[PDB]
């Protein structure tokens, strides 16, 4: 009723995540990362030493359950296993501790870009950080978009029912040329997007949105105006004449 159930529960969770990523790949396979490349995901497993120490302890517990000593060897083997649990619990943020007791830490993550027709991997980022600030922002913004699309889509449907997603300073490390591609990917997933942008990037979004809410503070009273880009420019012209 414990330990084994806790260990089984964690292993079950990892299985769910592997299934979720597997069923998230099919959603991304419908959208082209590059003009004709599209993107895929690989999970892999963590090889942290703490996990290997756990597997040895579990093997000892299983072997101990068959000894006829009035639950003496079974108790000892369980004692070692629980000690491992507390050790990780005390240091609740060490990489070894997290991998032991966190479902999303027992397996790695890696993105792979392929060819639409040629199935061979063309560029596999098997973790392999090795990327500029913009490149990582490109991968992350795309991966989140695919994750958001899948989450909001009702089971068995490829069109989300809750079509609004909100991004707050989404793009800051990517050039205006690569930022437009993300907006292209976001729309093609079927997600209506409401962007919160800093003073910068205002023309970055001007090519991918038709209206804007202007938030200006007037002391201790914030105000908002929903004005189309065309009506916003007219306000600027009055400013230029004011």
């Amino acid at each position: 009723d414990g330990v084994t159930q806790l260990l089984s529960h964690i292993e079950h969770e990892v299985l769910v995540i592997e299934e979720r990523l597997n069923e998230l790949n099919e959603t991304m396979f419908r959208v082209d990362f590059q003009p004709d490349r599209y993107l895929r995901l690989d999970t892999k497993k963590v090889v942290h030493e703490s996990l290997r120490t756990l597997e040895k302890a579990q093997r000892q517990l299983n072997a101990a359950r068959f000894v006829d000593d009035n639950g003496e060897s079974h108790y000892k083997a369980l004692q070692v296993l629980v000690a491992q649990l507390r050790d990780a619990c005390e240091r609740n943020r060490t990489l070894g501790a997290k991998a032991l007791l966190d479902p999303r830490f027992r397996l790695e993550f890696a993105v792979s870009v392929m060819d639409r027709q040629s199935g061979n991997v063309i560029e596999s980022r098997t973790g392999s950080q090795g990327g500029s600030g913009g490149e990582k922002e490109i991968i992350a913004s795309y991966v989140l978009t695919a994750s958001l699309s899948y989450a909001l889509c009702p089971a068995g449907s490829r069109y989300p029912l809750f079509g609004t997603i909100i991004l707050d300073e989404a793009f800051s490390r990517s050039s205006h040329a690569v930022a437009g591609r993300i907006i292209a990917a976001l729309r093609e997933f079927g997600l209506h997007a409401v962007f919160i942008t800093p003073n910068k990037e205002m023309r970055l979004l001007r090519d991918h949105t038709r209206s804007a809410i202007v938030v200006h503070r007037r002391g201790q009273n914030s105000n908002m105006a929903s004005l189309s880009w065309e009506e916003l420019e007219r306000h600027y012209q009055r400013r230029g004449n004011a």
Partner: protein
């Protein structure tokens, strides 16, 4: 370009309005419209931008992470109480103990409208204080779900002022297409049923606003999608039981 623009709003519900009343720094009643082909919230830094997102994230999540944009990685600074009270912690210069904009009895309402091929679904929330107390348990809540276009946040506030909470219950009884939930747990379950998405979908949506603090694919995946579900607390219970 434009041809794809018409897909949104056909097979899905797209936000098309936001109304606030004494929320954060948005004193009084404000209304913001959203375009079906995308929309941008722009303005000088620290005016109202992150407050607007938080008002929407409150309507959606059970325990929204307020200000995940800048405070991502550590605990958020603001909370529901501050937004209702309209504290101005950051903004100072003569700060008289945080500039509680509304210290006395107050009522704050936030309503979001979503549309799809003429069908309107308006979420809402009424949060009010009856006194000067600022403890969490002294805030009275009334989550509202509505499909009738005539049920606007202005109407709800008008009802509250006229006859308080008693009139609100009476209004729901005779109102068509209105549902009011005094406890947010029931209201969230209604959202899941309507949009046919689990709690994870909306919790991820809230985490999408804190995407700024991102790193290698590992940290994006282990901190952004596929919510915690860790077993660090069950381990303590198992360890304590083993001690016996």
């Amino acid at each position: 370009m434009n041809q794809v623009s018409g897909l949104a709003g056909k097979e899905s519900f797209i936000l098309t309005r936001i109304e606030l009343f004494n929320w954060g720094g948005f004193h009084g009643l404000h209304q913001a419209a959203i375009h079906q082909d995308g929309t941008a919230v722009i303005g000088p830094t620290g005016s109202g931008k992150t407050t607007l997102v938080d008002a929407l994230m409150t309507l959606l999540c059970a325990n929204p992470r307020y200000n995940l944009a800048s405070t991502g990685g550590h605990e958020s600074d603001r909370d529901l109480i501050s937004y209702v009270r309209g504290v101005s912690g950051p903004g100072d210069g003569g700060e008289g103990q945080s500039h509680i904009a509304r210290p006395g009895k107050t009522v704050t309402g936030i309503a979001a409208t979503l549309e799809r091929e003429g069908k309107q679904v308006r979420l809402g929330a009424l949060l009010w204080f009856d006194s000067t107390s600022s403890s969490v348990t002294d805030m009275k809540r009334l989550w509202l779900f509505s499909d009738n276009p005539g049920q606007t946040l202005e109407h709800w506030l008008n009802v509250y002022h006229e006859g308080g909470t008693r009139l609100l219950r009476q209004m729901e009884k005779e109102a068509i297409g209105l549902w009011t939930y005094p406890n947010k747990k029931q209201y969230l379950a209604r959202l899941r049923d309507f949009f046919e998405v689990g709690e994870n979908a909306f919790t991820l949506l809230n985490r999408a606003a804190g995407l700024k603090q991102l790193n290698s694919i590992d940290e994006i995946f282990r901190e952004l999608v596929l919510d915690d579900h860790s077993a660090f607390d069950r381990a303590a219970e198992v360890a304590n039981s083993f001690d016996g």
